Amino acid sequence: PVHKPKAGQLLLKVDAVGLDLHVINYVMHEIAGTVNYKVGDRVACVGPNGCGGCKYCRGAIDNVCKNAFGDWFGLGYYQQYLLVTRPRNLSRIPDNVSADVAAASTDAVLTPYHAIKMAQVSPTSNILLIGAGGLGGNAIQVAKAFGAKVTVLDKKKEARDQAKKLGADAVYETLPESISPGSFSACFDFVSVQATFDVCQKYVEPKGVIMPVGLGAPNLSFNLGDLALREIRILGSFWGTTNDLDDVLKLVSEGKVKPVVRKELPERVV
Amino acid sequence: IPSSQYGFVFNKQSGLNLRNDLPVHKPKAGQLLLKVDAVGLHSDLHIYEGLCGDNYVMGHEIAGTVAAVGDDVINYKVGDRVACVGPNGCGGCKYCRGAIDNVCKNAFGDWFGLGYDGGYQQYLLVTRPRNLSRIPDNVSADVAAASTDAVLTPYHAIKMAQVSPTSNILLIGAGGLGGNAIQVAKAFGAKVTVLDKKKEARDQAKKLGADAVYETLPESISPGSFSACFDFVSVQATFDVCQKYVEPKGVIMPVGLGAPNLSFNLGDLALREIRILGSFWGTTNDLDDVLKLVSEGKVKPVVRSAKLKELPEYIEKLRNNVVFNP
Amino acid sequence: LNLNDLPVHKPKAGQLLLKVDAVGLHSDLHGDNVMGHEIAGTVAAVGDDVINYKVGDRVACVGPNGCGGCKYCRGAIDNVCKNAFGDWFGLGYDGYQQYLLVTRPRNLSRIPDNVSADVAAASTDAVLTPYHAIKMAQVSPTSNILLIGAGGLGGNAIQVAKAFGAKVTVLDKKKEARDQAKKLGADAVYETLPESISPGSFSACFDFVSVQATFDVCQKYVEPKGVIMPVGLGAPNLSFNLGDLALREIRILGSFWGTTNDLDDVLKLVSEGKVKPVVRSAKLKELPEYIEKLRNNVVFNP
Amino acid sequence: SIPSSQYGFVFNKQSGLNLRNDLPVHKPKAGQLLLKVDAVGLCHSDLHVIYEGLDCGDNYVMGHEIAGTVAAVGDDVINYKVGDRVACVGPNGCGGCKYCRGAIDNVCKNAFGDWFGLGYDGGYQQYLLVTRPRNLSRIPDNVSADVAAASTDAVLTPYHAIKMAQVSPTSNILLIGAGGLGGNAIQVAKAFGAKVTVLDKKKEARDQAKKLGADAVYETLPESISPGSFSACFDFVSVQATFDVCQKYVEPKGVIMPVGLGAPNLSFNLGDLALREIRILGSFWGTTNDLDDVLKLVSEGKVKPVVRSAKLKELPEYIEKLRNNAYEGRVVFNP
Ligand SMILES: NC(=O)c1ccc[n+]([C@@H]2O[C@H](COP(=O)([O-])OP(=O)(O)OC[C@H]3O[C@@H](n4cnc5c(N)ncnc54)[C@H](O)[C@@H]3O)[C@@H](O)[C@H]2O)c1
Ligand SMILES: NC(=O)c1ccc[n+]([C@@H]2O[C@H](COP(=O)([O-])OP(=O)(O)OC[C@H]3O[C@@H](n4cnc5c(N)ncnc54)[C@H](O)[C@@H]3O)[C@@H](O)[C@H]2O)c1
Ligand SMILES: NC(=O)c1ccc[n+]([C@@H]2O[C@H](COP(=O)([O-])OP(=O)(O)OC[C@H]3O[C@@H](n4cnc5c(N)ncnc54)[C@H](O)[C@@H]3O)[C@@H](O)[C@H]2O)c1
Ligand SMILES: [Zn+2]
Ligand SMILES: [Zn+2]
Ligand SMILES: [Zn+2]
Ligand SMILES: [Zn+2]
Ligand SMILES: [Zn+2]
Ligand SMILES: [Zn+2]
Ligand SMILES: [Zn+2]
Ligand SMILES: [Zn+2]
Ligand SMILES: [Zn+2]
């Protein structure tokens, strides 16, 4: 029961789609396919699907578009053909990147890329990442590509092992006593419960940044005296922008990031 | 809304000519039709000097009222008052996405009234409504039109230079753009010193709020003491004053077009880490900002109105040294 | 810590001696073994190596008193120097006296000629602190800001913010603070934001109170990508809604006192008439009387 | 122990750079230290001083790329002790002005004419008196003095410029010149994640650029390279012809960094700079924090400066060689 219109629109034949739990009348957001654009172009979808006409979109921040709330690809707006209403929200897949890898890049890589870029990570950064799963594992690779030294905390042995293979410079279950408090230029929390926030706050340096990218609790608290006195910054981050997706696919193209991609959906995988 | 209208079309072979038999386009999905309320008129003269297009309605300073909208237009509705963002960016490239839709490669040759159709007509088809800015209720269409370049352009430069209330700036040339620059810079809280060779421009500069105005900087002004220098003339001599009087780590903005090339002293630029920044027109978001400043009374552009049919008479006048209502 | 035969130190090579002209007095009420952290004076003697100052220079002290040698100080962020914790002027290190030894002259700001020592002293914290926060938030003439709490700091914040060209809305529970806020140039002043103010509409929210309720207003009214600056210290911990912070990309930025360069900036604004701190003068010997008064709730010439 | 006399190379406007065997060795005062020089680099900037009248003062020991070991300290010095290995921050900032306080101690007004080996005494000698020990950076254990010396300028200068340009893993950058500075710039830029294209007029510098990790190296950019396609252009030569290539190939809103000093003046096309919003950013040397960052990159193996050593007495021979562009990479001298 398919669509087919195009006035300022295009038609995308879906080649790969990635797989929500917190969510759980629209087809359900990690999309790569084939058709500023001409038939045969390979493209990936920028989930936040910004309007393109507001101050946020114009802007460089099309991910926080107020007009598109409730109209994100597969989350307000898993199917064989997708009529793309707003072709501005597409990114060209490079020739050497497969549709499967592109699809797996549209969120699992895009999201930590956007946060790392926001934090202004550089080859002198000394960063802490908490949680090395879907997002976290890609965050390791993105961070290393920015030149950073990367320390990973994860409760799960297997995630610690994967983190070592993906290039982390140190991996631990808990930070040992020899790690000085106040020594990391940035802390990225992919878990975001209170305990994990409190470690970011203890181990972030003065003027450093805490990026609570995970969504593990509805509220978090920070110590105010400490945040003020040491000028800590907490920056929210959501998904990514169209330009960020271009950047991600370039990194993936150049071999700097290799996402791990693997419909019994009910039972990252693409 | 009518099916025909009048307007002034430019052709490389025969200049700018009245046509009273022009079509009025129906918007497609994604487009809108603007009823032109005011359209401003030196860049149109440059036309006589051989610059940008071939068979387009001129007029690049445009204010109007949305008359009809296509499908898939959700940001605007009939009756909305809007001003056009001249560079008319594509909206799909990295520059536009971006925050720098003023340097869009895909829109070169497609700017409003300078390659694509503009405001010297009654009804303008806007192919890219993203390139519109809402006119506040207390701002007239005439003043909005006069803001779309004369205020937009210096505002874009001043914002890029990151001027603040601790800035100590030098502006060279207080004419059309320079005078508006004075007002914009004061609204950012800056101290403003103005150099102009013409007595009348110096007088006007005082009236517009400059803190000091001079023909030449006196010997008591220390070299290396201004945080930013904006040069609205841009010949070598005025560049050299910017370079001598800019502070270390300060910025020179050569916003005028008085010479095709300018030289800088390299040892000085390097040692004192001087920055030279190019600036062109402005962005959509800059226009929103400008209209807010105008709305709040912080900037008051100077504008006289006339009927669009009078345009040829005023073109000759400007050529020998104003907005239009269609 | 009490009052008439204290010694006067001779500076070593890299030090200087400051003759105190004015010293300001809330935090004093709240290091071990001279207080007074809002200091203006005149250089009275310099040590052999000192090239940036000479006898007769009028200077104000930047309270955090950074070490000058660490990465934070080198840096541009001398206000968060780890080495100087416990060594701040009048809060761990020695203005409530006639002559102050400045170990570390980099932590001084030249007072402009047309600014009095009294005003300079009242600028060193009451103006410096909100200036530092406003500058960090990158306020501009297009900014639409909310300030909560219009007292000592908040009132100066109003004037600093208006100098940057911002539109300023003030919330305060106390009628008299609302009145002062109106006089100091705020564009709108309220006891509670009326229902007509749209949520998500302010580019920056500065909370000079910083209890939970006041944080929650900042979080409801800050626009996407906007900034919340919890400058007050009204609770030890505050909480934020995560989904909202992430989804709308809100930023919370800590701010502490100010830097040496910020103090140069503040004294320039004061010099140019942009900010006019409110100050009454008295003799330093009167200090104990004014301390009691503020408790049951001014600058001093030694 | 420490001798009371020593040898070194002094510059004077009247008679150029000359060996002297009767130089004093100063005893530090309270806040000072004495550095025994282990390695000192030679820079193309020494040539501008000797042969082009680039005026930095008169009558000082040259050598501005300095690594050594603390030989004695004055009474009040606690941050360093005898035996510490340190490299000098060339601009030798005052520490007390707004620029130094600041984060920009490289453009200190007070220190004009007082830079190590360029107004104040430098490293072409056995023992250097350091008046301001703030302007030192600790050499990590695994970094040799020769490499640290090369790092104080040949690496520091391009690091500072690259950082100022905000190079990232999505940057596509052009570097012109692959000698002392340019070779390091290659490695620094790769550590920031950039794609790097190099131009050099000398075959042996091109060959070295390839070995240092450049993604492309050319004499002249081929036709397949689109104008307006580089996010940043770093010119380590800075003559009009190389500036023009930066200006043709930089993207809109991109940056041109004229780090080299090959002409007294350069010109730009104004219409092009304005229309495409090109930025030209001056960059000088680097800062104390930058040097700590650089030595950490070198220590972590991300940057491996190309350096060959020689005895300080050989300096006049290597000066001639550099003047004729006769070697690649840096040469440093052991006193
Ligand atoms: N901000 C955004 O735009 C955005 C986008 C996508 C996902 N998310 C959120 O990011 C989070 C991570 O998603 P994912 O897909 O990578 O998750 P995932 O399940 O693949 O991985 C979670 C990891 O966290 C580790 N972990 C959990 N609790 C821990 C603890 N207490 N201490 C140390 N390690 C711990 C687990 O061992 C696991 O390795 C989720 O909360 C998700 O809702 C946010
Ligand atoms: N960030 C720093 O570096 C720094 C420096 C100095 C002081 N401070 C802190 O800033 C805060 C204020 O200091 P001050 O000198 O301005 O205090 P103040 O007593 O002079 O002013 C406080 C004002 O807040 C108002 N207020 C209190 N609670 C309120 C609420 N719930 N809602 C609305 N208004 C309320 C009061 O009516 C009064 O007008 C203090 O917590 C102080 O410790 C911070
Ligand atoms: N801005 C600063 O702070 C600063 C600091 C140090 C050096 N410099 C300047 O940087 C420049 C480079 O110094 P260096 O020590 O690396 O020089 P070097 O002599 O070690 O190397 C110069 C390189 O440039 C190449 N080259 C020369 N002319 C060329 C041209 N026209 N086109 C392409 N390639 C060319 C040569 O083949 C050689 O490989 C010098 O001018 C020096 O004065 C500037
Ligand atoms: Zn939008
Ligand atoms: Zn997903
Ligand atoms: Zn575009
Ligand atoms: Zn115009
Ligand atoms: Zn410090
Ligand atoms: Zn105080
Ligand atoms: Zn050198
Ligand atoms: Zn050098
Ligand atoms: Zn200095």
Side-chain angles (χ1 to χ4, degrees), chain B residues 172-197 201-205 208-214 216-256 258-299:
Chain B
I172 303 178
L177 263 58
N180 286 307
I182 294 161
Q183 296 182 64
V184 174
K186 294 301 302 171
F188 277 82
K191 181 173 191 195
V192 176
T193 300
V194 175
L195 289 183
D196 197 304
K197 69 176 178 178
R202 295 197 294 276
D203 287 351
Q204 175 99 113
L208 292 169
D211 301 273
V213 5
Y214 304 107
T216 83
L217 291 170
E219 160 271 10
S220 62
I221 309 299
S222 167
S225 60
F226 293 92
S227 54
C229 299
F230 301 79
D231 187 354
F232 296 93
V233 14
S234 291
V235 300
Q236 189 63 49
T238 61
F239 187 90
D240 288 349
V241 355
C242 293
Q243 185 166 13
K244 171 175 172 196
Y245 286 95
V246 73
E247 283 175 346
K249 271 294 208 213
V251 57
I252 300 170
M253 313 279 296
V255 289
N261 301 269
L262 295 171
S263 293
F264 62 89
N265 180 300
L266 206 207
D268 179 79
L269 175 128
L271 175 53
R272 301 150 74 233
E273 301 197 324
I274 307 307
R275 300 177 278 138
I276 298 167
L277 309 184
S279 196
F280 174 61
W281 214 333
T283 243
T284 44
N285 286 359
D286 288 340
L287 188 57
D288 301 339
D289 296 355
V290 159
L291 289 172
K292 181 186 276 195
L293 299 178
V294 173
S295 185
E296 294 167 357
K298 298 173 174 193
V299 172

Side-chain angles (χ1 to χ4, degrees), chain B residues 46 48 50-51:
Chain B
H46 309 321
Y48 290 113
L51 229 341

Side-chain angles (χ1 to χ4, degrees), chain D residues 107-108 110-161:
Chain D
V107 298
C108 183
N110 302 328
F112 232 81
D114 206 33
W115 308 326
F116 288 114
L118 291 163
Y120 181 66
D121 296 319
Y124 295 146
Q125 60 181 335
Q126 299 173 267
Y127 293 93
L128 171 65
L129 181 71
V130 175
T131 55
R132 292 169 253 161
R134 77 168 259 122
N135 298 317
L136 294 173
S137 189
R138 294 179 185 283
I139 303 178
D141 278 342
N142 73 149
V143 176
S144 73
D146 289 354
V147 172
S151 300
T152 51
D153 187 8
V155 188
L156 183 52
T157 298
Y159 172 86
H160 177 80

Side-chain angles (χ1 to χ4, degrees), chain C residues 176-179 181-182 184-190 192-236:
Chain C
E176 297 95 314
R178 297 196 294 272
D179 288 350
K182 281 165 195 163
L184 292 167
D187 302 274
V189 8
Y190 304 110
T192 83
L193 288 172
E195 259 96 12
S196 62
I197 307 299
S198 167
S201 59
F202 292 93
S203 55
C205 297
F206 300 79
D207 190 353
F208 298 92
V209 173
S210 289
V211 299
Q212 194 61 52
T214 248
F215 186 89
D216 289 349
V217 356
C218 294
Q219 187 165 14
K220 172 174 172 196
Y221 285 96
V222 70
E223 78 185 14
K225 270 297 208 213
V227 58
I228 299 168
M229 314 279 297
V231 177
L233 305 169

